[model samples]
Target: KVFGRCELAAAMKRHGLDNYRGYSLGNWVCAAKFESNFNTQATNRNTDGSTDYGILQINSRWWCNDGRTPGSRNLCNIPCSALLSSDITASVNCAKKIVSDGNGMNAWVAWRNRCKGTDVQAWIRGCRL
Candidate 1:
């Protein structure tokens, strides 16, 4: 499922990303936009290794069990395929774990490149959330 800007914001907020780690709804929305364009089934392989999955692009290097990355710790304890679910609940939950147990939102390079230091508020300007 592909979500719109405000829809992704509302979904992330509903799933507990709303200021979960000093990141706001706008931040999540913007990050999602740049990360996967709000597509729940998004996936991308790194330049040489690892794979990013789902809307937030949780990587296979250290997050999900993809049976590819060497010694995948799979801290999220979830199959990488689950992240592709359109429901997005698993992806959202894994993202929360990524923020809390990992390096926070910086885990996403897109966040630094597109979301951070930008008019993030504009991402949700039309949304009343």
Candidate 2:
């Protein structure tokens, strides 16, 4: 499922991402924008035999077990396919696990290249959420 800006914002906020790990909702919005453009089924295969799954593009290497990655860790304890669910509940859970690893939102490269060091609030400023 694809979500509009405010719709996705409301979803993320409902899942307690508003201030998870001190990263504001704006940071989540910005990351999602660059990661998958708010598309729930987004998937990206990496050159390293791993894949990124779902809106946040959570990776297969350490977060979820896709059963193909050379050293899959499955730290989030769910199949990689689960991240692609339209509900986004498991996706957000896995994302929280990544954030809890002490990297904050840097777990995503999109956040690094586009959202980091920027006024991320604009990512959600126009949203009614």
Candidate 3:
């Protein structure tokens, strides 16, 4: 939806995500690719009856309120809909908080399955960064 990887990378960098929290740009980019394919409005219902929101696929069980959930951790204290936006500042900030919780990129299943131990440079290839 955002055209290509380069645009996503550039947008991420502009939001100060370049090598943020000790994770490389490629790591974030790769995670984004698998999580949402750069679609801001992406939403996925997990088999556990939870939902993943936005490009980062943040979980409603812990990160955001889905309105229907009665007792979510809501650590980010944000509405899940806020993440489903063309402007990703809120999502990125929430992701930073999630990463800072000490799980690194391991918080994302896509990161563990695809981005980890792979040739992630392809995520940022040809991008000016």
Evaluate model 1: give its lDDT.
0.86
After the best TM-score superposition of candidate 2, give how far the Cα of residue 50 lies from its true spot, in angstroms. 0.5
User: By lDDT, highest first, what's the ranking?
Assistant: 2, 3, 1
For model 1, the superposed segments whose C-alpha errors exceed 4 Å read none
- Candidate 1 lDDT, tens digit per residue, 2-71? 9988888887878888888888788888888889989989989987578999999999888898888885
For model 2, residues 54-117, the per-residue Cα lDDT tens digits are 9999999898998899867889999999999989899989888899998888778999999999
lDDT of each residue in 70-115, candidate 3, tens digit only: 6668999999999998999888999999988988899999999999
Let me know the TM-score candidate 3 reaches against the reference structure: 0.94
Clashes of each: 0, 0, 0
| Backbone clash tally (model 3) | 0
Span of ten consecutive residues with least summed lDDT in model 1:
98-107
Top candidate (lDDT): 2
Q: Rank the candidates by TM-score, best first.
A: 2, 3, 1
Clashing pairs in 1: none
Q: In candidate 2, which residue pairs clash?
A: none
For candidate 1, the TM-score is 0.92
After TM-score superposition, what is the CA distance of residue 89 in candidate 3 from its true location, in Å? 0.4
Query: How many angstroms is residue 122 displaced in model 1 relative to the true structure, after the best TM-score fit?
Result: 1.2
